[PDB]
């Protein structure tokens, strides 16, 4: 069970989530609203921004604890940036979710937060056969 | 059974996969590590950056049958950016399945794509109860 | 049977071939003749250049069968140098095989015309064993 | 028996062959590749260059050798480019094979090897009656 | 089962490795090829550079188990430098196994690392009787 | 049965062997011993040279059994540096061997020796799991 996180600022183009018990952990939405003339249609693009970030404190003391020191802390950080028209919800929500899957097997099935890339990684597109 | 894509531009800094049946469809991994030490600590920090791109055509008209009208493509992008430490990896993994769980709240079941925020979304934070 | 092609305009030093039916296919050769003479030897040299030029309808949607419609051409250029003594002529057409081959399996049995390359490749030289 | 080919030099824009017996001869794959606005469509340009050298000795003592003296050496150069979207790879490869044929004709039939044109060779295009 | 190592950086010229586990102990090559001017003679010579450091911790101090390892480790380096003509690969493999046999002499099996040059020692060479 | 060597420069710091048959051909090693400061503690480092030349002839001409060798030979050097702590002499030798070892996986049975650096060669650390 997931703790619920409660808005701070509240704003047509930005919600700020913070977790009440620890608001230095804070996860941001900002959309932003263009039109653009692709086949001389305006279409309405939108660049939603989502940012999560967490305050870690990592001493790390290898196997021993004792009492509580300062933690000093470190910045986690996950920006998300989806750009599209809004008139292709459906195709855009499809190459989110193959970003999802890419994203997943280089990362989390992968070593690529340790510094690593695998060339032999089963990269896959959006479309299907 | 969705379409393989494989390397067409292949650095250790940075990979660029492609599809072989649209070559504008491309996915990139560029991670840079830097030696970020907190106090009295050596951390090493890995950032990865993940990029999506499709060229999808513009939606045709609603009651339209003609067999072939091309209209011009648009850019349909996705960016993900992961900073932390290598030592918080399984702990960094969690945050962005927590991320997976946010975005997918406000964009896949909501409105973020065509353009509105609800500030009555369900955000949850990474910590268990 | 493919379709016999005519000179359009002759000179010694370079002959350009054209298909009356379609003047925008044009096939040339260029001798450059020069006695680039080594060490105590006397050698004559020629620098041959063949171009081959198509211009090429792009290709149409692939679910499309509408009578006529015509999109703009694409330039699709092949050009060889062959650089040898006449002293060497053998040889060199036995180079000239052994590159025939070599470009094949890069080419046409590979991915090299979309735009990737295959270290594995089984590349031969001219040599035998 | 062609004798195999290892690479010495890997690159995902350059991989370079060389006979393990004589690393003077070489073999050289380039791939560079740009978007070119033909049809208003993006069609995605790939232009390999093929380049095979082999350093021959021709000293042509005619009609007797009695002992190795230092050979010295001219370069027998071949150099192909290919130039072409990659959604017509088909007819690309259709021209290759008709610029083999031409140039086969040409130089291995012919005499344009020693410095020659025959303004009566059969050249044909790649178009079928 | 000795952990195995994947590329953080790979070029050409250079690849490097590390372990997933540690950062610290890397094992990188360099090669560089240049054509050697030898009378009568055209062969070309490869220089390779292998490196391998590992960040080992000060040893701990005799008698205390203490809580948490505070040492302030070290380094570690091995580096070995191979030159010589790819003609004669099969001389440059016995001179190496040569080498590694002498060092393995002086200091696997004597006493080197310490600091004693022992004189008589039994150092044998390549060439076989 | 290889040949053994003698020492020709005998010094407390530096040994250098030469064989009998063939003056050429030496063996030398230089051991540089420091005390390195490192926090609270005091451990001493000695830095071992180890020089292996060989003045083979450049490879004789094909097809040609002269009367007298006349060719001018050329030069193949292996030098080794190793570098550590002799309170950690157990771990070096460890490294040393692991050393060997990938050296041996990349030039031995690998084609770095004609310049190829394979970039999925098998390389193992020190530590085992």
């Given at each position: 069970a997931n703790k619920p996180m409660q808005p701070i600022t509240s704003t047509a183009n930005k919600i700020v989530w913070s977790d009440?018990?620890?608001?230095?952990t804070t996860f941001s939405a900002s959309l932003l609203r263009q039109r653009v003339k692709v086949g001389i249609a305006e279409l309405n693009n939108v660049s939603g921004q989502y940012v999560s970030v967490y305050k870690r404190p990592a001493p790390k003391p290898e196997g021993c604890a004792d009492a509580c020191v300062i933690m000093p802390n470190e910045n986690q950080s996950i920006r998300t940036v989806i750009s599209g028209s809004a008139e292709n919800l459906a195709t855009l929500k499809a190459e989110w979710e193959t970003h999802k899957r890419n994203v997943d097997t280089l990362f989390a099935s992968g070593n690529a937060g340790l510094g690593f890339l695998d060339p032999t990684a089963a990269i896959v597109s959006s479309d299907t056969t």
């Open positions: 009440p018990t620890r608001l230095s």
